[PDB]
Design a protein around this ligand. Sequence first.
Ligand code: CYC
Lengths: 160, 54
Amino acid sequence: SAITKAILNADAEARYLSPGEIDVVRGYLASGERRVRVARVLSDNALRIVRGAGDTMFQKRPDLVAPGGNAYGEVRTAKCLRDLDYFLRLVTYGVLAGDTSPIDEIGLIGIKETYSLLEVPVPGVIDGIKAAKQQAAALLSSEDAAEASFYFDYVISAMS
Amino acid sequence: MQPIILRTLSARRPVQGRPNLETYTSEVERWKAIAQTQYALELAKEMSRPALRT
Ligand SMILES: CCC1=C(C)/C(=C/C2=NC(=C\c3[nH]c(/C=C4\NC(=O)[C@H](C)[C@H]4CC)c(C)c3CCC(=O)O)/C(CCC(=O)O)=C2C)NC1=O
């Protein structure tokens, strides 16, 4: 959270929250209702966003679901769609929490070597996440789209 | 027996061989991917359920 990050900085320096930390927390608390609105819209349309993202990613890379592909098979395609759903949920978490920590502890620390061991092609994951981002921006207004795109782009960048 | 009766008329079809079906094959692969995705969504929903809450 923004609050957790500010408090951890104060605690590590053994001091009360500074005027800048207080202003950060005030800004986050002021943005709370907008964050909740965006997160609610994303959570209500999770199935549509993931279904469209998977369609777009498999259309752009038919080799994934072709024989010999990483996602080939019912169980593997299920796991791929499940990962897309996971990343969408984590983006909603980041939007609510006002920082990238939930996305880090839950889904981005160790994902690189995880996907490396399983030979999961990271460009395909990035394509799926960009597809999810576009599906989401379709549902959100321009300002809400920008807010959600911050965390979508963070996930994309952390994958690469 | 002196009418002109035509016995062996040529058929419409040309002598060539069957054309390749690569594009049709790719489009069928696309439909198969679309069909696989909707069942994969159900199994993926089953995958995200909690662990030991039976
Ligand atoms: C909640 C946070 C969280 C994340 C993010 C997560 C990702 C994740 N995906 C995995 C497997 C997988 N992940 C994918 C998905 C990828 N392969 C496809 O080609 C696509 C390019 C791409 C998805 C867009 C696939 C196909 C597997 C199975 C591969 C295998 O069995 O080796 C695994 C290994 C364990 C398992 O099989 O379930 C993890 C840890 N797990 C988590 O607990």
